[PDB]
Symmetry: C5
Subunit: 268 residues, 5 copies
């Protein structure tokens, strides 16, 4: 909460305004409420639309992760339904699917996958994966080798191969989606503009309130600031969905659910 | 709603400002309207967006439930159309599909699936299902085994297997979509912030209103407070569409519909 | 057009405020514009968001019906192009597709589909359909059966069977969508809340306008009221897409269009 | 539009040279009520313009799909049946006829010349006989693909890959039809237009109090804002209406013709 | 983004309003705030909706480019998984997929693709591609011949050919979406209204503010103009996402990422 300092700096800005209202006539400065209404409203409208975009970006992240669990569940389901004997293949594929999740998590958090990957895969595979500048993509390529092998060994027909291939595509879209969200921020200009504007607004506001509210100036002014600043900071918290804040996605729990899910489906 | 408390708790504070308005003088308190116009409009705008976000959650949730019915209807149709004679599988698969929907409702209402499960499937299966930490998924896996067995037995080809396989994917997307709406709400700041704000605004509003309205003050403040608080609680309601409030989804009716659909006439169908 | 009732009731509410404006401050009752601008604005925002939802639900009802035409057109096309010889199957499948439309209309309007079904299908099939607790869904099953026969008789392969099965899936999505829309209104609370506030607001309004407009009160309180009610009433006129009112979907004409189209494509 | 700005100036001058008589009599117009009205209308115009915009965008997407589907079908024909140039040419004909015919259908203009240039007279009579000419064209494109399958030049699989493209065109056809026979509101766009229209005419009277001579200036600026927003919605609401901008629809049908002649090597001219 | 010119011209207009407020009474002109408030809020609402549309277009554009990378990655994945031995095919298709991306960037920027094409493909292919009303389209058709030839040679079945066909189908959709976003400014009613509107409003605002603020006019007037103009020009940037403004897609970087991914997946080293 940087908000609380911003509130107290605003109570102080109001005192400065009461004490200084005297020399207003002298200095030749009069400030009515009316234009601050115009400005405040304008700012609230833009804050509303901005916040809308931030929430949508957070929702997209959530959906992207939702697909991971859906597509992995159904790939394992398919593997069991189509090749119920082939538990060798099941185990290999499930570990790739589980690696994909953790890999994706680490990629977005800008952290080290080595532990999670080493915990899941053989060494001849882990070094291949960490070798690529696109590890997560590499895990998908390898999961693909698995299904292709079962195809070449005639365990899968072209059709059944096709069914599982679609699920890798789904995972591909998730990877791209997340990378896209990670690297493409909501234009910095939104935070640039609005952060400036909101701060300057809350700051100048008591200077305009004072003529009308006098000593009441602090109370009302801090209230209006709390409304604006709270809404503005909610946008901020929603904007980095892949971060570590408690307000961000619990990527760790999500990857756990995924792992436990795929292990449950295989009996582990 | 649960608004009449705070609507009354507000008629009080509105008399206070009719008794106080001459004493503003003495204490040193001026309070025009225009600042409260500004603050009120801002809150309206934010209430607007919040409510819209809440409704989308409602609508998505309704849609995900819609797909359960569609996807189950079409899977049964496919089984009837492609394997018209295989009533044993028809029956097995339908009860899994019916279990699926009830199981999903229990999952989301945080209630016990056992009664509904036992009503539909044999007990060894009820224990396979309850054994899992994700029972709905387990029912899907079991439904899939039914389809896969018909395939291993060469009653389905790969193509016709895949037609049915698609429908199970559709249901997996419902499960996933539903879990996503349930585990994560709209981040808890949303409700914490807005409720504080709307109410704080509502109580102070008359203190600033009197000077203009004089006597008509407590009315025109309760009217405004109704509007703001109405909107805020409806949002709070729709936000949790698997809840049990009046404006949430009728999940029990929806599973009843699904059930009556699949089991329509002791499960009997015209044969091609 | 009960709107012109409320407009008239409004002219009357002006006139009591015009003449009763005297005894106002003696009582101590004042109504300024400013707080009614706050309410008016807040209500307009909520009216906006709401009518939005109303509009979307109506657009969805059109889209769904639109898909009937699209999917039935394309199923008929596929049958002509894949099985040009097989006019018997053509005519059967077409009568089911036409029955489906009419049946869906009857279900949404809660009317008796019997005559239409009897004009299109043999009595036995009608009996099958009407015996079901879900007749329209049963029409899909029968059409599926016709397609299934073609498959058994090897006139269709699995692949081409599949191309046509996809179309019955689309019709399934239409049927579910309509059912969902029919049983899921825009939540009542919206219409409740808003009808209270809009009604009370347009009532209390010439009161809060008279001490500003005096003799221009009626002509301005009514123009404002017509504006809120016009816009509140656009919701009313969009919330019953399946109805028979002038502003509701012309489902009979759309059903004729569907039938006319399928008959054009089979040269009847 | 510019007629209603000239009327606004006229009403503004009336406002000044009449402000005298009427406020003396008991009949007053303040700014605050017309400010609540105007903001409400602005809000409504906002939501209205949102719905309009999204019908405009839907029309662009549908037409976008024609370009995409037609390109990919022809690509599929070349990649899968490289040698069947006669089929390539017939199919491209129908594809191009489909576009032009859709455009004609939406703009309620005559497709005859486009059909006669593109197809044999037998087919043109057949297509013109139908009450659903565009759908009939898709059906004929269908027969082409169908015959290639009958002759065992397409397998059921590869027939299917091409069939999808025809379905995409089916979706476009119906989507556009639905966008055309609209709107959805009924004669309520006439209500909000008149609401804006009346609001802009009463407004100088409500302003003259505060602005006197400045009235016509500030009044016409405001009127302009509302009337512009309103008429932009009118345009957007009706992408296929009788007074629409036909430049991009014509651009699209030309692009696709051009693209397909390119893909089938009917372009460039030979050396 | 010569926005500061518009702001300074606004500070100027403010002084013009102060110095001329003296003559104000004498000339016979009154200008209250309340009517400018009405217009101002209207315009704000309009900028709100407008800006939101612009953002949407930008997000769509970004998404489409997202799909290039996804679809191309997965095409190469299918090629390796299904035809592990056909490394010639691997290389030729990859150079088409890489040519596709750069060619798309060129198309959208209206620049010449000749250099990049020549870097990636034999000259015969370059000539074929350059000869076409739509080079990206021709590139997809060439990629299509590759998998087509593999199908002809019975190295792909109809089904596995189809799986790969779908990916080219996806690229066609991307191509179309980008064409649509690039040739869809809309009717230039977003300049006759929003740009000049906001502009005029901002310069008349001080004339209207001055009776109330006196010397404070330019401070308040600048703050309000900043707010509106910031909002407006950000819309402008977002509206044209394939442009070269600050806030427009780094298409060259996105193309490099694409190329690098595809090179990574097929054994090769940048
Ligand atoms: Cl899936
Ligand atoms: Cl296993
Ligand atoms: Cl389905
Ligand atoms: Cl279709
Ligand atoms: Cl026939
Ligand atoms: Cl026929
Ligand atoms: Cl396509
Ligand atoms: Cl050719
Ligand atoms: Cl050719
Ligand atoms: Cl893909
Ligand atoms: Zn899926
Ligand atoms: Zn296993
Ligand atoms: Zn082993
Ligand atoms: Zn490391
Ligand atoms: Zn489906
Ligand atoms: Zn049965
Ligand atoms: Zn009093
Ligand atoms: Zn379709
Ligand atoms: Zn026939
Ligand atoms: Zn009705
Ligand atoms: Zn496509
Ligand atoms: Zn050719
Ligand atoms: Zn050309
Ligand atoms: Zn004067
Ligand atoms: Zn894809
Ligand atoms: Zn290779």
């Amino acid at each position: 909460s940087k908000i609380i300092f911003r509130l107290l700096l605003n109570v102080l800005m109001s005192i400065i305004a009461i004490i200084s209202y005297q020399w207003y006539e002298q200095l030749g400065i009069h400030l009515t409420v009316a234009p601050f209404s115009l400005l405040g409203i304008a700012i609230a409208i833009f804050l509303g639309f901005r916040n809308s975009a931030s929430y949508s970006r957070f929702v997209e992240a959530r959906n992207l992760w939702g697909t991971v669990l859906i597509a992995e569940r159904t790939l394992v389901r398919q593997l069991r339904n189509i090749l119920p004997a082939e538990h060798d293949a099941h185990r290999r594929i499930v570990s790739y699917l589980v690696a994909f999740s953790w890999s994706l998590k680490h990629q977005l958090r800008k952290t080290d996958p080595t532990a999670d990957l080493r915990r899941l895969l053989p060494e001849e595979r882990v070094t291949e994966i960490l070798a690529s500048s696109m590890p997560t993509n590499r895990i998908l390529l390898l999961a693909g080798n698995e299904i292709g092998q079962l195809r070449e060994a005639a365990k899968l027909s072209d059709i059944t191969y096709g069914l599982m291939d679609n699920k890798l595509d789904e995972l591909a879209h998730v990877l791209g989606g997340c990378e896209r969200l990670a690297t493409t921020p909501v234009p910095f200009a939104y935070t640039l503009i609005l952060q400036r504007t909101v701060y300057l607004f809350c700051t100048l506001l008591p200077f305009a309130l004072v003529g009308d509210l006098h000593y009441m100036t602090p109370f009302v002014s801090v209230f209006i600031s709390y409304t604006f600043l709270s809404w503005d900071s909610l946008a901020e918290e929603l904007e980095d969905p892949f971060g570590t804040a408690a307000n961000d996605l619990p990527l760790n729990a999500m990857c756990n659910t995924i792992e436990r899910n795929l292990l449950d489906m295989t009996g582990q």
